[PDB]
Design a protein around this ligand. Structure first.
Ligand SMILES: NS(=O)(=O)c1ccc(CCC(=O)O)cc1
Ligand SMILES: NS(=O)(=O)c1ccc(CCC(=O)O)cc1
Ligand SMILES: [Zn+2]
Length: 259
């Protein structure tokens, strides 16, 4: 069974023994060297179309928490930018640190943010998520950095349900949540071909990482850090530092949408 995690004994430096693609040619995350990324005029406008998004449930999976969406129809989709065709939102989750100075997966000129939001989408040409993760263009993940400052009003409903999903395997109803409240003003981005950042580390992802971070309050991120990796009744292991560090860029170029 899967027994990877983020500890010293099961963390990122161990994953390659059960998931050898961990040492592959298009792994994520990466450091975004802002001076080496090149503006790409070929990029078409990015279209985030979440008006009809239908959230259903929030789940503590022992690695992070997922806010899950009804992806049985094109209710919430990502198009444009580097993407060919339509990518449907299935879930979002975060990665965060034990302290405000770390937590993001991607870095920007080696800077680590306090957290990183991942909105996960699958290419509808492949019919469902499981088939999409067999394809090099199966997924698109919209990544958004979080810095600590003023509160993000649209995050507070997520924060407030976390007490009900403290431990691994717990879920709660989470209907009528609008993911548009988690976006920054600007859709300026960097993009590159990469992978899932957790096992199974599959190389299916077009990454779209927004330049502008959102601000969340210290009190909001402190509540993330009260979650548990462990199950109910087990010794407490706070869910913190659930991020993979930057991986080798190898034969890739990062493109910028902005000049
Ligand atoms: N390569 S990996 O998936 O990161 C991994 C690392 C450590 C163990 C040992 C876990 C145990 O005691 O069950 C199992 C699997
Ligand atoms: N952090 S990330 O790259 O946005 C990501 C997205 C989805 C999975 C789910 C993988 C699975 O279904 O096993 C794993 C990791
Ligand atoms: Zn993620």
């Amino acid at each position: 069974s899967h027994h990877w995690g983020y500890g010293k004994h099961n963390g990122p430096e161990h994953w390659h023994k059960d998931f050898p693609i961990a040492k592959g040619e298009r792994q994520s995350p990466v450091d975004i060297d802002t001076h080496t990324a090149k503006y790409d005029p070929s990029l078409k406008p990015l279209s985030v179309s979440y008006d009809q998004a239908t959230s259903l449930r929030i789940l503590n999976n022992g690695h992070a928490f997922n806010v899950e969406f009804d992806d049985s129809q094109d209710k919430a989709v990502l198009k444009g930018g580097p993407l060919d065709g339509t990518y449907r939102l299935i879930q979002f989750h975060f990665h965060w640190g034990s302290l405000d100075g770390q937590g993001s997966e991607h870095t920007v000129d080696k800077k680590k943010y306090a957290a990183e939001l991942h909105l996960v989408h699958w290419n509808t040409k492949y019919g469902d998520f499981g088939k999409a993760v067999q394809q090099p263009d199966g997924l698109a993940v919209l990544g958004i950095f979080l810095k600590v400052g003023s509160a993000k009003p649209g995050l507070q409903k997520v924060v407030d349900v976390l007490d009900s999903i403290k431990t691994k395997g717990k879920s709660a109803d989470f209907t009528n949540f609008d993911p548009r409240g988690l976006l920054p003003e600007s859709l300026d981005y960097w993009t590159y071909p990469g992978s899932l950042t957790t096992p199974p580390l599959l190389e299916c992802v077009t990454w779209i990482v927004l330049k502008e971070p959102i601000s969340v309050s210290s009190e909001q991120v402190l509540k993330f850090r009260k979650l548990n990796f462990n199950g109910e009744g087990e010794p407490e292991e706070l869910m913190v530092d659930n991020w993979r560090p930057a991986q080798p860029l190898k034969n890739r170029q990062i493109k910028a949408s902005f000049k």
